[PDB]
C-alpha cells in the first residue's frame, strides 16, 4: 500500500469528458506477454456526486464494449475507490484538465501510473514528464506501454456493455 | 478482600546444552516457576537464553536413494528432478539442467488453492496466535490435481492491466500435495444478524483487543450497535499420511537433541504452534461496530434502529440522511450521529467496504473460520522422514509442561466475572469498569483453580483435582 | 454452561496385521463439545509399530510401470503420452520424445472433479476424491457441447446433454407448517447402505447453507402461518459411471492398501471422514431455483385474500386483479406488511443472481435465462444414483478384498450412529443441533440469539420433541432397540419409531 498527493481542488467538472489513453506504467502479467495487443482506450467521464461515473469504451474480439464503471468517493477530494480480485485505489495525480492526465491506481498493493489526453500527438515534455514520474514510481523504461493511437471506439452498443456498476 | 500480592519467580537457567555445529550454539532455560500477579515486581529477564558457540565438530544427509536438496535435507523422488517446478526451495532440483524438456499438464498456469498457506500454519492455543508453517503449503510434487471455479465465466474488466476477459485464468485452482480435497461452498443467503446494546459492558458480554479501542466509550451516553454475519467459501482436508514439511519445519525439527530438553522444544512449540490443522472451512467475517452519541441521536428524532438501517443501505444489506449518504467522512459520521465504526472485518481483500464487494472478493483471499486440529507432536507420525519416536515422545512431554506453565488459570482468581490474562511473565485482569481493585472489587463468580500436581501412584494410577458454579470435571485420572 | 468433548477409552489393541506389520486401537465418543466447551484436538486413535510374521499375501506382481509416489500400476502404452496417468507424478519423466500429446486442446467436463468425489450419506457432504475422473485410458473421446471441444474421461460411460427445458415453476400450497415438512424433510437405507434408483441429493442437511435455510424457516413454527413453495428444474447434463473396472483415484487407492484385516474401527471410520460412505454410478447435473412465501393467516384473512389469489397469481406476477398488494404487501414485506419472508434457494449456476437480486431481493423476473447460463457452466448434482464405498474394493485392485468389504460393512454400521446430530445435547428455543467432528453447533431460529439460542423476542415458545441415539440392539435373543424423545421433549409442544426391532 502506497500514498501521495491528488490534485489540489480536484475539479471533477472541469476533469470531465473524454479522455484518450496514452501509455500505461505498470508489471501485469498481461502486459508484458499480450503488451503487442493493447486496444485502442477510450475514457469517457461525468461528475455524479463526489463519485464520478466512468466509461471506457474498447473493442474485445473487434466488437467496440463499454464498460461502466463508478470511481466512488473515498472521503478525499482526488482519490477514488474502485472495484476479481483486488482493490482499486484511483489517484488524480497530475492533470491540466485541457490536454493531459496522470492517473494511478493501486491494486493487492501494487502501482501502475496511467497517462492520458485529450488528442495527440500529446506533447512530448509531458510524455518525459510521465517518463520521468514511472522512474521514480520505481518501475523500469521497459515496463512502459504505448497503446495504440487509432482504433478508438466511437459508441458502444446496448447489447455489447459491460455493467460492473 | 485484595489478594496478597505476589513476586515473579524463575527457576535457574538449566545446565546448557552441548554446542550445536550446524549454527554453532549453545542454550539453556528455566521455568516460570511464579508469575507476578498483582503489583508483584516482573521478573526482569527472559525464559530463554543461548550463546555464539564453537566448539562444533562436524558442519541430516539421510535420503537413501532419493534426491537432496543443498542446505534442505528435504528428500526429492529423482523424477522431481529437473521437471518445470520448484521441489526444494534452494531450487536444486531444477539446477544444471540444460537439455531438458518438460510436460505442463496445463496446470502450472493456475492459482493455489485460495487459503492454502493460511491452512498450513500452526496454531498456538495458549494466545490464540498462528505459528509458522507446518505442512509446505505449495508442495505440488509431481501431482496436478485441480478444483474447478464456476464463476471464470463472467466477463470482466480490469483497469489496472487494460484487460477485458472472461478469465480462463480462474477456471481452476491447482490443489496442493498436502490437501485430500478442496471444495468451494456456493455462496448462500447468509442472513445478517443485528443487536442492539445499552452500554459497552453488555456488548462486550456477548463477545466475551478492540477492547482496547472501546473503553474511549463507555461514558454513559453512548450506545452501540453491531453488524455481524460469517461466511463459508470453501470446506478442507489435510492429508493424514505422507505429509511434507515445511522445508523450515523441517530444519527446525532435525536440529532438535534426542537426549530431552524442555527449552530446545519449548522454543520449537513457540515457533511452530501447539497444534496443527487437520481440516476445516475457509472463509470470513463481516462485522461492524456502531458507536453512537444517545442524546444526539434522540435530537435528530431518531432510534439506533434507524441509524443501523441507513447504515446498512450504505453497504447494500438487509436483515436523517442530507449528510450521512455513504457515512464517508468524520463530519457526515458525527452528522448522522455516529461517533465511530468499528472494522471487525476478517477475510476479503482498517475502514470500511460493502457486501457484495466483501462477498465476490472472500472466496479468493479467505481466512480459516472453522477447524478441526491435533497436537503438534502427533505430525511426527504421519510425515514421509518416518519415524521420530524419541523426537515425539519429547514433543508430547513438553507440550504438557508448556501447556501448564503458561495457562491463564495460574492468574490468581479476577472476581466480577472477570477474565484473567497472563503476558509474558506478568498475570494482569480485564475486568470491565465496574469493580476496581486488582482483582477488581451483586452476581456472582465461579472459575476453577488450575490442575494440581499429579499425584504420585496408588496401583499404577494418579490422581489430578481442582476446585472454585465452574462446570465441567474437578478430577481427573492418568 | 459449556459442556466438554469427552472420548471412550481406549478400545483393546488389536494383534499385528501381517501386510501392515502394525497394531491399531481406538477410542469413541461419548459426549460432543457443545457450548465453547472444551472441544477433543487430539486423535481418536493411535497405531503401533510391531513384529510378527503370520504369512501376508501380496498383489500378483504388476505387469506394467509403477508409479514412484503413488504406487499404481499403469500400462507401459501410457509413458510419454502427455498425460499424468500415475496421476500423478511421473510415467511422464525422462521422455526424449511425447506421443500424441493432442494438436487439440481440451477442456473437461464442467464440475467433474465432483462426481469423482466420495459422499458422505449421513451429513450429505462431499469429501475426498475416490474416482479419478482426470485419467484418460489413453484413448481420446473428443466431445462437443455448446462449441466446446471437451475430453472424456475412461471412467465415465456417458455423458449426454440435455434440451434446454423451460423455467416452468411448479406451485405447490401449504397450510400448516408441520405440512410443509415435505419440502425441507430433504436417508431411506436398504441392506448394506445401498439403495437402488435416483433420488433428490438433499445435499443440504447437516449441510451448510442450509443452515441459513434452518435458520429463516424454523420461526415460523407456531404456525399461523400459510406456506407457498415455487420450484422449477433445469437438467443440463445426464451422467453415468461405466459398469466397472474402473479407474480408482490414486489417493484412496493408498489409503485402502493401509487398512488392517483384523477388525479395527478406528481405522475405517478415518476412511469413511476422508472420503464418505458412496460414490456416484449415475447422476442428473443442473440446477433448482426454488423460493417460498411465508404468509400470516390473519392478515391475509383481513385483505381478504387466499391462497389460490397467490398460488394463480404466482403465475407471472380465478382470472380478476391480485396484483394488487397481493404484489406490494409483498414488494414492501419490508417496511409495510402480511408477507411473513420470501425465502430463496438456489442451487447450480449460484454467482451473481444471488447478490442484489434473487436471495431476498426481488424475488424472480426473466433473469431465470441469465441464471439458465450459470447453471450451464457450474451445474450442480442434483439428482444421484449411489453405491457404497466397499463396491469399490474388488480383487483386481486389492488383496484381501473380500476381507476389506467385509470390515467397511460393519464399520459403515457403527458409523451411521457415530455420526449422528442425536448425541447433541438440547439446544432451545426450538433451534438445530448439527454435529462436526467431536464439536456440536446450534442452528438457532431468526430471532433467537446466543448458543443454545437461549435469548428472544417471545415468550415459552412451543419446544418440538427431538430423539435421543438409538440404544444398542440387545444383540440375537431377537434384536430391537430403543429410542426416547427425550433429546429436547416438548415443554409446551410436538416423529418416527421409538421402538424397532431387525430380524437377526
Ligand atoms: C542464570 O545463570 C546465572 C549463573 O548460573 C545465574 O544468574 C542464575 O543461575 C540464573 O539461573
Ligand atoms: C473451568 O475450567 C474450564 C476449562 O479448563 C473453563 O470452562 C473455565 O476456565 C472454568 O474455570
Ligand atoms: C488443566 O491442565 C491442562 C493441561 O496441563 C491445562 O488446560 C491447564 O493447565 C489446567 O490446569
Ligand atoms: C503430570 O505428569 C506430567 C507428565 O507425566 C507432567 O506434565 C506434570 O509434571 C504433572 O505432574
Ligand atoms: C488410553 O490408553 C492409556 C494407556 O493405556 C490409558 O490411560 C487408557 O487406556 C486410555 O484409554
Ligand atoms: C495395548 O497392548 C498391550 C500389550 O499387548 C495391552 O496389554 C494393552 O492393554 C493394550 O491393549
Ligand atoms: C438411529 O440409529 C441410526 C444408526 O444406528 C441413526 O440413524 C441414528 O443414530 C439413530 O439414533
Ligand atoms: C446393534 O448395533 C450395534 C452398533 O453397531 C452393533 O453391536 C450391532 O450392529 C448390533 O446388531
Ligand atoms: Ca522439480
Ligand atoms: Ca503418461
Not at chain 1, 483486488?86 to 498493493?109: C, I, K, N, P, W
Not at chain 3, 442452528?443 to 439460542?453: D, F, H, K, R, T
Amino acid at each position: 500500500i502506497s500514498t501521495i498527493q491528488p490534485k489540489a481542488n480536484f475539479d471533477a467538472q472541469q476533469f470531465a469528458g473524454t479522455w484518450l489513453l496514452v501509455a500505461v506504467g505498470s508489471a501485469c502479467r498481461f502486459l508484458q506477454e499480450q503488451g503487442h495487443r493493447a486496444e485502442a482506450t477510450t475514457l469517457h467521464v461525468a461528475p455524479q456526486g463526489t463519485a464520478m461515473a466512468v466509461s471506457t469504451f474498447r473493442k474485445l474480439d473487434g466488437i467496440c464494449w463499454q464498460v461502466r464503471q463508478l470511481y466512488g468517493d473515498t472521503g478525499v477530494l482526488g482519490r477514488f475507490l474502485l472495484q476479481a480480485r483486488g482493490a482499486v485505489h484511483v489517484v488524480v495525480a497530475e492533470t491540466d484538465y485541457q490536454s493531459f492526465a496522470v492517473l494511478y491506481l493501486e491494486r493487492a498493493g501494487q502501482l501502475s501510473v496511467k497517462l492520458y489526453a485529450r488528442s495527440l500527438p500529446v506533447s512530448d515534455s509531458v510524455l518525459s514528464g510521465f517518463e520521468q514520474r514511472v522512474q521514480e514510481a520505481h518501475l523500469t523504461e521497459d515496463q512502459i506501454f504505448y497503446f495504440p493511437k487509432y482504433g478508438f471506439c466511437e459508441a458502444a452498443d446496448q447489447f455489447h456493455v459491460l455493467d460492473e456498476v | 478482600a485484595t489478594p496478597a500480592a505476589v513476586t515473579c519467580q524463575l527457576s535457574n537457567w538449566s545446565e546448557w546444552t552441548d554446542c550445536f555445529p550446524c549454527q554453532d550454539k549453545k542454550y539453556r532455560h528455566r521455568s516460570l516457576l511464579q508469575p507476578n500477579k498483582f503489583g508483584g515486581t516482573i521478573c526482569s529477564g527472559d525464559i530463554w537464553d543461548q550463546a555464539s558457540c564453537s566448539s562444533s565438530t562436524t558442519c541430516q544427509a539421510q535420503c537413501g536413494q532419493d534426491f537432496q536438496c543443498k542446505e534442505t535435507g528435504r528428500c526429492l523422488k529423482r523424477h522431481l528432478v529437473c521437471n518445470g517446478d520448484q521441489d526444494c526451495l534452494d531450487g536444486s532440483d531444477e539446477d544444471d539442467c540444460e537439455d531438458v524438456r518438460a510436460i505442463d499438464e496445463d496446470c502450472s498456469q493456475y492459482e493455489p488453492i485460495p487459503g492454502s498457506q493460511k491452512a498450513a500454519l500452526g496454531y498456538n492455543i495458549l494466545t490464540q496466535e498462528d505459528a509458522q508453517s507446518v505442512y509446505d503449503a505449495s508442495y505440488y510434487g509431481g501431482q496436478c490435481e485441480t478444483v474447478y471455479n464456476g464463476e471464470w465465466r463472467e466477463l470482466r474488466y480490469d483497469s489496472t492491466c487494460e484487460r477485458l476477459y472472461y478469465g480462463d485464468d480462474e477456471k481452476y485452482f491447482r490443489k496442493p500435495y498436502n490437501f485430500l480435497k478442496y471444495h468451494f461452498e456456493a455462496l448462500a443467503d447468509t442472513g445478517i444478524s443485528s443487536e442492539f446494546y445499552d452500554n459497552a459492558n453488555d456488548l462486550l458480554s456477548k463477545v466475551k483487543s478492540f477492547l482496547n479501542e472501546l473503553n474511549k466509550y463507555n461514558e454513559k451516553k453512548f450506545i452501540f450497535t453491531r453488524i455481524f454475519t460469517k461466511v463459508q467459501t470453501a470446506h478442507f482436508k489435510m492429508r493424514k499420511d505422507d505429509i511434507m514439511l515445511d522445508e523450515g519445519m523441517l530444519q527446525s525439527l532435525m536440529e532438535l537433541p534426542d537426549q530431552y530438553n524442555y527449552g530446545m522444544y519449548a522454543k520449537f512449540i513457540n515457533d511452530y504452534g501447539t497444534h496443527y490443522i487437520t481440516s476445516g472451512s475457509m472463509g470470513g467475517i463481516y462485522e461492524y461496530i456502531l458507536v453512537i452519541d444517545k442524546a444526539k441521536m434522540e435530537s435528530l428524532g431518531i432510534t439506533s434502529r434507524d441509524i443501523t438501517t441507513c447504515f446498512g443501505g450504505s453497504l447494500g444489506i438487509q436483515y436523517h440522511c442530507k449528510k450521512f449518504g455513504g457515512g464517508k467522512t468524520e463530519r457526515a459520521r458525527k452528522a448522522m450521529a455516529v461517533e465511530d465504526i468499528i472494522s471487525r472485518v476478517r477475510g476479503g481483500s482498517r475502514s470500511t467496504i460493502t457486501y457484495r464487494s466483501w462477498g465476490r472478493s472472500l472466496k479468493y483471499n479467505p481466512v480459516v473460520i472453522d477447524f478441526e486440529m491435533q497436537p503438534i507432536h502427533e505430525v511426527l507420525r504421519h510425515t514421509s522422514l518416518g519415524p521420530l519416536e524419541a523426537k515425539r515422545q519429547n514433543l508430547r512431554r513438553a507440550l504438557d509442561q508448556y501447556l501448564m506453565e503458561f495457562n491463564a488459570c495460574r492468574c490468581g482468581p479476577c472476581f466480577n466475572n472477570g477474565v484473567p490474562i497472563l503476558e509474558g511473565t506478568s498475570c494482569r485482569c480485564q475486568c470491565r469498569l465496574g469493580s476496581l481493585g486488582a482483582a477488581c472489587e451483586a452476581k456472582a463468580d465461579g472459575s476453577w483453580s488450575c490442575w494440581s500436581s499429579w499425584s504420585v501412584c496408588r496401583a499404577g494410577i494418579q490422581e489430578r483435582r481442582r476446585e472454585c458454579s465452574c462446570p465441567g470435571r474437578k478430577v481427573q485420572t492418568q | 454452561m459449556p459442556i466438554d468433548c469427552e472420548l471412550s477409552s481406549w478400545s483393546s489393541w488389536t494383534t499385528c496385521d501381517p501386510c501392515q506389520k502394525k497394531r491399531y486401537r481406538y477410542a469413541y465418543l461419548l459426549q460432543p463439545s457443545q457450548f465453547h466447551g472444551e472441544p477433543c484436538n487430539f486423535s481418536d486413535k493411535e497405531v503401533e509399530d510391531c513384529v510378527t510374521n503370520r504369512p501376508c499375501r501380496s498383489q500378483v506382481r504388476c505387469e506394467g510401470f509403477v508409479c514412484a509416489q503413488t504406487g499404481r500400476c499403469v500400462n507401459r502404452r501410457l509413458l510419454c503420452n502427455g498425460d499424468n496417468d500415475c496421476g500423478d507424478q511421473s510415467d511422464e519423466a525422462n521422455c526424449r520424445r511425447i506421443y500424441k500429446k493432442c494438436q487439440h486442446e481440451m477442456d473437461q467436463y464442467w464440475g467433474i472433479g465432483s462426481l469423482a468425489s466420495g459422499i458422505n450419506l449421513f451429513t450429505n457432504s462431499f469429501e475426498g476424491p475416490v474416482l479419478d475422473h482426470r485419467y484418460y485410458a489413453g484413448g481420446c473421446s473428443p466431445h462437443y457441447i455448446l462449441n466446446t471441444r471437451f475430453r472424456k474421461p475412461y471412467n465415465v460411460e456417458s455423458y449426454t446433454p440435455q434440451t434446454q427445458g423451460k423455467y416452468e415453476f411448479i406451485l405447490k400450497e401449504y397450510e400448516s407448517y408441520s405440512d410443509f415438512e415435505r419440502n425441507v424433510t430433504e436417508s431411506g437405507f436398504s441392506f448394506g447402505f445401498k439403495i437402488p434408483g435416483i433420488f433428490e441429493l438433499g445435499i443440504s442437511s447437516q449441510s451448510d447453507r442450509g443452515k441459513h435455510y434452518i435458520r429463516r424457516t424454523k420461526r415460523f413454527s407456531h404456525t399461523k402461518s400459510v406456506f407457498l413453495h415455487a420450484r422449477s428444474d433445469l437438467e443440463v447434463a445426464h451422467y453415468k459411471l461405466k459398469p466397472r473396472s474402473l479407474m480408482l483415484h490414486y489417493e484412496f487407492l493408498q489409503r485402502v492398501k493401509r487398512l488392517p484385516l483384523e477388525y479395527s474401527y478406528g481405522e475405517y471410520r478415518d476412511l469413511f471422514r476422508d472420503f464418505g460412505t458412496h460414490y456416484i454410478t449415475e447422476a442428473v447435473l443442473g440446477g433448482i431455483y426454488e423460493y417460498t412465501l411465508v404468509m400470516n393467516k390473519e392478515a391475509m384473512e383481513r385483505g381478504d385474500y387466499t391462497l389460490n389469489n397467490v398460488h394463480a397469481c404466482a403465475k407471472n406476477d380465478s382470472v380478476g386483479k391480485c396484483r394488487g398488494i397481493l404484489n406490494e404487501i409483498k414488494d414492501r414485506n419490508k417496511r409495510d406488511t402480511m408477507v411473513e419472508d420470501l425465502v430463496v434457494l438456489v442451487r447450480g449456476g449460484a454467482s451473481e443472481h444471488i447478490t442484489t437480486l434473487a436471495y431476498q431481493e426481488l424475488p424472480t423476473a426473466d433473469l431465470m435465462q441469465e441464471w439458465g447460463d450459470a447453471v450451464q457452466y457450474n451445474p450442480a448434482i442434483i439428482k444421484v444414483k449411489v453405491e457404497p464405498l466397499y463396491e469399490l474394493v474388488t480383487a483386481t485392485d486389492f488383496a484381501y478384498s473380500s476381507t476389506v468389504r467385509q470390515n467397511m460393512k460393519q464399520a459403515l454400521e457403527e458409523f451411521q450412529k457415530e455420526v449422528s446430530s442425536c448425541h447433541c445435547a438440547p439446544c432451545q428455543g426450538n433451534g438445530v443441533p448439527v454435529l462436526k467432528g467431536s464439536r456440536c453447533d446450534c442452528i438457532c431460529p431468526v430471532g433467537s440469539q446466543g448458543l443454545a439460542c437461549e435469548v428472544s423476542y417471545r415468550k415459552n415458545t412451543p419446544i418440538d420433541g427431538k430423539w435421543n441415539c438409538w440404544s444398542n440392539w440387545s444383540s440375537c435373543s431377537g434384536r430391537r432397540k430403543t429410542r426416547q424423545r427425550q433429546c429436547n421433549n416438548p415443554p409446551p409442544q410436538n416423529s418416527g419409531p421409538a421402538s424397532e426391532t431387525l430380524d437377526c
